């Protein structure tokens, strides 16, 4: 049961693009070593209920995980394709978010609801995740239909630790529904991001194509 190199994959997803080297020891156990990253504008000018989203990333992530197929010997491809992924990553990722809340549009942050009013308001966030050795857990589907290639999709999360975080608006004096100003509410949401257990996780989704040769 030694791990045999079998090829590579190309992938794209929420942490950016890249790919991995692949090994398989048997129908149940395999290994991926890869990189995701890039300077990418994940969305620009994207309008939803009066509000434009912009997100930019600048990521360097390199990972190593095992892929385990509980039913990897199954002749059902719906079961043979399922796997759990587990390992760790070097993580050095940076996200810029911008919400431009338009005229008379409404946004909710930490339970407090604000209105854009006559001019709207813009809210910005910088999130920086740095961890040399971040544990990773994920679930994927990669059914076998070819000796030469296949496709896959995966969702998981890195236990990165809380990011460094900065939140800001170009109008902090707006009062929300619970009475806190926008400045104060952002401060509060900044503290939750910087400390709550929930935000120690960096979620991820991706898809791609495998090549075996």
Rg (CA), the chain: 21
CATH number of the structural domain 1-213: 2.40.160.170
User: 108 vs 21, 111, 114, 123, 182, CA distance in Å?
Assistant: 42, 6, 6, 12, 10
Q: Which residues share a beta bridge with 188?
A: none
How is residue 49 annotated by DSSP? T
Q: Resolution in A, one decimal?
A: 2.7
C-alpha 131: how far from chain center = 15
Burial of 106: CB neighbours in 10 Å, binned 0-12, 13-18, 19+ = middle
d(CA 40, CA 25): 35
CA–CA separation, 87 and 32 (whole Å): 9
At a CB cut-off of 8 Å and minimum separation 6, what does 106 contact? 49, 50, 113, 114, 115, 116
Domain boundaries, the chain: 1-213
Structure tokens at 113: 């609801």
Structure tokens at 184: 């104060």
Residues near 38 by beta carbon (within 8 Å), at least 6 away in sequence: 16, 17, 18, 57, 58, 59
Sole residue written with tokens 């199954």 = 74
How far apart CA 114 and CA 175 sit, in angstroms, is 7
| Dihedral Cα 121, 117, 188, 46, nearest 10 deg | -50
Question: Beta partners for 167?
Answer: 125
Number of C-beta neighbours around residue 206 at 10 A: 21
Q: How far apart are the first and last CA of the chain?
A: 20
Find the DSSP H helices in the chain: 77-80, 182-195
Torsion angle of the four alpha carbons 95, 159, 16, 62, in this order, in degrees rounded to the nearest 10: 120
* Structural method: X-ray
Question: What is the rounded distance in angstroms from the CA atom of residue 15 to the CA atom of residue 39?
Answer: 10
Specify the 3-state DSSP secondary structure of 178: coil
Helix (H, G, I), strand (E, B) or coil at 81: coil
């Amino acid at each position: 049961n030694q791990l045999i190199p079998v090829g590579a994959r190309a992938e794209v997803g929420t942490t950016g693009y890249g790919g991995a080297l692949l090994w398989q020891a048997n129908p149940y156990v395999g290994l991926a070593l890869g990189y995701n990253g890039g300077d990418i504008s994940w969305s620009d000018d994207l309008s939803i209920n009066g509000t434009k989203y912009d997100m930019d990333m600048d990521n360097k992530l390199a990972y190593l995980n095992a892929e385990i197929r509980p039913w990897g010997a199954s002749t059902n491809p719906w079961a043979q394709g399922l796997y759990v992924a587990a390992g760790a990553a070097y993580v050095d990722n940076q996200y810029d978010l911008t919400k431009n809340v338009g005229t008379n549009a409404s946004v909710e942050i930490d339970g407090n609801r604000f209105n854009g009013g006559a001019n709207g308001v813009s809210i910005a966030g910088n999130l920086k995740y740095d961890n040399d050795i971040a544990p990773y857990i994920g679930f994927g589907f990669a059914p076998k239909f070819s000796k030469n290639w296949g496709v896959f999709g995966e969702v998981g999360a890195y236990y990165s630790g809380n990011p460094k975080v900065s939140l800001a608006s170009n109008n902090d004096a707006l009062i929300g529904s619970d009475g806190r100003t926008l400045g104060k509410t952002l401060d509060d949401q900044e503290r939750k991001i910087a400390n709550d257990d929930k935000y120690k996780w960096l979620p991820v989704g991706k898809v791609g194509v495998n090549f075996y040769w």
